[PDB]
Amino acid sequence: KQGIREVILCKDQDGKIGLRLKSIDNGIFVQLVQANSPASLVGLRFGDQVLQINGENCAGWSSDKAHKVLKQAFGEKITMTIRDRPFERTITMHKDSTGHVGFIFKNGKITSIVKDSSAARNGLLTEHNICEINGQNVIGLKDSQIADILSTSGTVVTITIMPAFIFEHIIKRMAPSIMKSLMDHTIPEV
């Protein structure tokens, strides 16, 4: 049970739950959750791992397979087993007299730590993407937007981070396989 819960969702009026999933290392992960969706209401988050859908194990499923199963799910009612944000970690820092915690970032990724800052003391790492600051999601925001959130924060700055190589793999959108097939499997029948 640790870090794992079972949820029940119901498709909305349009037959949707508000997800895009992605196959990574023989698991299925949440790539996108739509705001004000069935999926958002049961607390699905970017980077969550989906272990089962409607009693079936997701292990080894392609993105296409997972989407197909949800699309073709006969019930209004859908069960999922979720492992919550496995690749995220939380770091809490405190602003100095200039209002800073001590790290340099670009494109949402931490690239340098200032020695003897709060970030240093708390062991913040580079090559990590910021996911949330003080409860506000920053995935997809511009650096100026991130800067504004940090600026307006109080002294206590609690961030979640994820290794950049994992983040990039989860967020990266694949071509339709439709196209990948067309281009991969070019073998004439006759």
């Binding site: 800073h100 915690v101 001590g102 790290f103 340099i104 970032f105 670009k106 690239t111 340098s112 970030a119 650096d143 991130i146 800067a147 940090l150 700055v157």
Partner: peptide, 8 residues
């Protein structure tokens, strides 16, 4: 060298 980075 890195350029146009942001300090937090």
């Amino acid at each position: 060298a890195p350029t146009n980075e942001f300090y937090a």
